[model samples]
Structures are given as C-alpha cells and as structure tokens.
Target: MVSMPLYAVMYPVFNELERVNLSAAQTLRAAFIKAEKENPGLTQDIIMKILEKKSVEVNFTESLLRMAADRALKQILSKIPDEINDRVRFLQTIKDEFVKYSKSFSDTLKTYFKDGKAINVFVSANRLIHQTNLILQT
Candidate 1:
C-alpha cells in the first residue's frame, strides 16, 4: 500500500485545468471565426496539437485524481456562470454530471480500497477422483 497525499492527487487536477483552459480558448477561437472576425494569434491546429500531447508522467492514482479534477471543474463552473458563454455553459452542465458520477466512483473506490490495502490471494488443493473398475474393460 502506498501513501497518497492530497497534493499528489491535486497535481493532476491542476494539469487537467490547464488543458481545460486551452480547450476553452479553442472554443472561443471557434466562436470568433463564426463571427467573421480576424484570425487569432494562434491557429486552432496548433492548439489542438498541444491538447493532444499526452502527459509525460504516468499517474497510477488516476481514479482518485479524476474525481478530484471533476470536483474542481464543477466548482470553477459554478463560480463563473454569468461570465461564461453558451459553449462554456454547455460544458458546465457536462461537468456537473461528471461531478455526480465521480462522487459515486469515489464512494465505490473507498469501499473497495478500505484501509488503503488491496489484497488478492488464491489457493488450490489437489483432488483425486476414484473410478472403481470403470476402466477395466479398456
């Protein structure tokens, strides 16, 4: 069992927030394009590539991190409702749903990983079958 600090879990949440910020910017760019405005400083393709880049480090505490990240997104959307556009409003609704799902996921994980220990053991015993005179004819 490994001890996981809250900060460790929050680290990925912050990383995900950075991605969300870029995605929100990309959405704004699309909105600008639809309005027939001049191209923004950065192109959508580059933004997309940056978004596509995978995290260099692997996080084994993904389930916990995801729950925390969803909660953070939920709080952020709740705090900035009036300032956000329609696209952001749509995302807020989706994030709300994710927050609900994450709550359930968090509960299940807590139950499964109680005491911060996960154990898996298996044992097999030898067995013998008796066939009295069953193979005599063969």
Candidate 2:
C-alpha cells in the first residue's frame, strides 16, 4: 500500500474545481466526478435546497471542500492494499481528519465571532463529507 497524506488526494479535486466557474451545478458535478457514482435520489434541486440559505460564495466554498474530502477518502480506499486492517486504519485516519478539521473551523469561528452561530456551517460541511463517504462506500 502506498502511504500518502490526505492532501495528495484532495488537491487535484480542488484544482479542477478552481479551473471552473464554481456554479452550484458545477460543484455538484465536481463531486460526482470524484465519487464516480450518481447517488440515487440526489438531484441538483435537492442539492440547491441543501445549500439554499447559504450565499453563493459559501455554497461554492463548502461544496468544493466537501467534494474534496469525498475524493480524498475515495483515493485512500482505492490506493490501500486489500486488507481489512489496512482499510480500517485508513478510514479511521480519514474520520479523525474530518473531526479535526471541523473542530479547527469551529475554534476559528469562536475566535472571530462571539455568537458562535456560524459554527453550523462547519458542522454541516462535516456532515456532507460523512454522508458522501457513506454513499460512496455503499
């Protein structure tokens, strides 16, 4: 199994999204590109509604982040040797990274905003990554 840092899996996805205009459809398309599967019952409208209340900028940023995280997990799973122990180790590492990123974003929010209301953004983004991972694994 090749040992690679998480970012090595993520950077290419980010780079591709950066080359595009970053519309909602394009973001979702980028996600699907990395996932390589069309998640049943998930549509552009549903995704738009999921991101409805967010600004275009927020939608673009979070969508890219979530998609990159998804791609990272997929890359990790694909590259690792076909051993249960190896898979578990990689999944656990990815899970820990997601939690760490969420916590770091939350901490940053607390430092900048006293209300802490915006922490939901990070939380939702984390959930998006987790859900996307689940879909991919299934």
- Point out where model 1 deviates above 4 Å: 1-36, 40-43, 56-99, 103-138
Q: How good is model 2 by TM-score?
A: 0.22
Q: Rate the local accuracy (lDDT) of all candidates.
A: 0.33, 0.47
**Backbone clashes, each candidate:** 0, 0
**What is candidate 2's local distance difference test score?**
0.47
Each prediction's RMSD over C-alphas, in Å, is 24.3, 17.5
TM-score of each: 0.19, 0.22
Predicted candidate 1 versus true structure: per-residue lDDT over 111-136, tens digit per residue: 53354321100000000000111223
Give Cα distance to truth, residue 109, candidate 2, Å.
3.2
How well is each residue in 1-138 modelled by candidate 2, as lDDT tens digits?
121211344335455555334575457556655443344333444445655767765545544554453355544333222221364764563454456655665465455346534335444445555655655676
The alpha-carbon lDDT assigned to residue 118 of candidate 2 equals 37
Off by over 4 Å in 2: 1-54, 58-96, 112-138
